[PDB]
Design a protein around this ligand. Sequence first.
Ligand SMILES: CC(C)(C)OC(=O)Nc1cccn([C@H](CC2CC2)C(=O)N[C@@H](C[C@@H]2CCNC2=O)[C@H](O)C(=O)NCc2ccccc2)c1=O
Ligand SMILES: CC(C)(C)OC(=O)Nc1cccn([C@H](CC2CC2)C(=O)N[C@@H](C[C@@H]2CCNC2=O)[C@H](O)C(=O)NCc2ccccc2)c1=O
Ligand SMILES: [Cl-]
Lengths: 306, 306
Amino acid sequence: SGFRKMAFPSGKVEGCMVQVTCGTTTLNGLWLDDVVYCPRHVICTSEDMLNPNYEDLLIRKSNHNFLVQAGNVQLRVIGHSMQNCVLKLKVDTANPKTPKYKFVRIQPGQTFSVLACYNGSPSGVYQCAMRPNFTIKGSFLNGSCGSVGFNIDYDCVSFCYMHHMELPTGVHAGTDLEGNFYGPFVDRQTAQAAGTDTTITVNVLAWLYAAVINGDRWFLNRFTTTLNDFNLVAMKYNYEPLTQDHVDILGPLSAQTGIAVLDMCASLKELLQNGMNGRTILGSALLEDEFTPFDVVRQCSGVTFQ
Amino acid sequence: SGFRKMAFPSGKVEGCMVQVTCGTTTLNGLWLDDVVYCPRHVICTSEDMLNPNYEDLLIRKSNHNFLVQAGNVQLRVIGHSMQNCVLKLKVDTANPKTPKYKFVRIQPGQTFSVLACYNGSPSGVYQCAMRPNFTIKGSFLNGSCGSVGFNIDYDCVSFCYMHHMELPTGVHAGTDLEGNFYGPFVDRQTAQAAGTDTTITVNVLAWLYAAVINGDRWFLNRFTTTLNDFNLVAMKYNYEPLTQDHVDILGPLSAQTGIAVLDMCASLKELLQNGMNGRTILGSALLEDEFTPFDVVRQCSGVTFQ
Ligand SMILES: CC(C)(C)OC(=O)Nc1cccn([C@H](CC2CC2)C(=O)N[C@@H](C[C@@H]2CCNC2=O)[C@H](O)C(=O)NCc2ccccc2)c1=O
Ligand SMILES: CC(C)(C)OC(=O)Nc1cccn([C@H](CC2CC2)C(=O)N[C@@H](C[C@@H]2CCNC2=O)[C@H](O)C(=O)NCc2ccccc2)c1=O
Ligand SMILES: [Cl-]
């Protein structure tokens, strides 16, 4: 037993990280088969980032202006193209460590592991949620651009995130691996509103089921509620409305614990109205929303990869 | 910016995990050079674990009774020995993925990454502290025994922990890689007291410095205190006494922030007496003690490995 914010084992991704340098700027790239993916802002100076014309900036660059290093190994660039906000550098060597992989665009409220990298070198791994407002609350310093987010399914790495920027509010924005930003963000150093964030209700409920499974039961009450009554409460506390799709995804946790989803909603309701009264749930003094229902099942059933 | 509970990249350790089976029991082993390390309780039945005579149980086992599998690869066992609570299985093949490594016995309050494994297969990575009472609050299910804790320094993996058991209170106990338990625990299914745990004061102070560096400053007050006055407060709230060695380790964080360690102690004092008044620090509603001073420096300076 016990419950931890667990990241995927990072080894398959570690083998794909490289350093990419263009003029003055170095950041991380992702080397899969004979393509290296990195943020297109690798071609910008600090001045350019204020208001970049990426098409005009990229026209000045040739293959030989992209320095790509895998460890101490220099890769030869034989092609470059821009796809949305990412650069694809064709190289003359397929990465021998290329894992089975897919590119996925994740939904808001879904979770993934970030491998924070500097100069092509892995420094740390952590688990986070795509916020409803399409930001992430990460840990990123200079040089971390090009760091990637991912999920693993047995032997398949599903890349979902590439780090592009820190907003002036200190939260993080980036793209899928086709270079499409999550949310309204652009790769420009300008004020950008992220808009109202909300709590991921289905995740909080999943984590309450995890708590019950681990013997943290104090918040279970004598009450039930309705989807509509609960959503009146969710609206007031800036929680995502719960839908029947959410109820359906929680079904297996309901089944094991014998706690009807709407009964757990009444427990959540009472926590939102009353607070935690100085107590904790799975060692947290707030309601945790960075576990999906799928996360809780995996952890509570100890599912592995390779 | 931002601050996350980050684990080490796990790839170097993933390459060392194997499955070990003896009679009915399978768990994880650690394959370094031509030795596989695993918990000696691999030789026990459920009945044996009640009151094992490990010397008498091991005498019944021969090399060929230890089934060791690295992926789909069967390793040949040419030697076995018991060292304290671990078994060392000599195998006829050196692990080609053996990273540079050391065996270390860590101090209470030090942190490390756990790679949770089942049947020799990595499932997840998370960061935790060795509690002052020599337990860890992990996430471990059946089959996770032999999972290891570690730190990385550039290219060197320092193994510090091997998972042996869950106490009836739901916390976790294990050994260094020489098989010596952390704390008073034995590898027997019997009631075992862990004794009073305490909060790791130097870690909480390190995390308050991390908060200030990230712009979370609300808890900074107009007060200072003395080491003795602060330790009167630490005693009352079951915090570890702060020593001048702790003050010295915090020096670099003091220097950058301009906040004298004893001023930060007065902030901590006020938080312990007054509580958080429904506010958060780096997205936590309680005082976090699973970051060392060394952790905060690494993260706040973005230090990498290979
Ligand atoms: C003085 C303190 C507060 C300690 O640091 C900064 O102001 N740092 C930065 C200010 C402005 C830009 N950056 C870098 C680019 C370096 C100036 C040349 C930057 O934005 N780097 C990161 C991503 C950011 C940094 C903090 N958190 C993040 O996620 C990224 O790796 C990158 O390469 N961005 C492209 C880029 C290139 C030039 C100018 C801006 C951005 C900084 O690190
Ligand atoms: C019914 C529920 C509550 C869901 O599960 C259990 O009671 N589980 C277990 C009860 C008793 C023992 N174990 C295993 C051993 C299996 C029975 C054969 C066990 O202790 N396994 C783990 C470590 C534990 C399990 C939970 N958290 C941990 O850290 C370990 O991998 C191992 O191999 N231990 C050696 C061992 C061998 C035989 C009997 C006890 C222990 C269990 O998993
Ligand atoms: Cl909390």
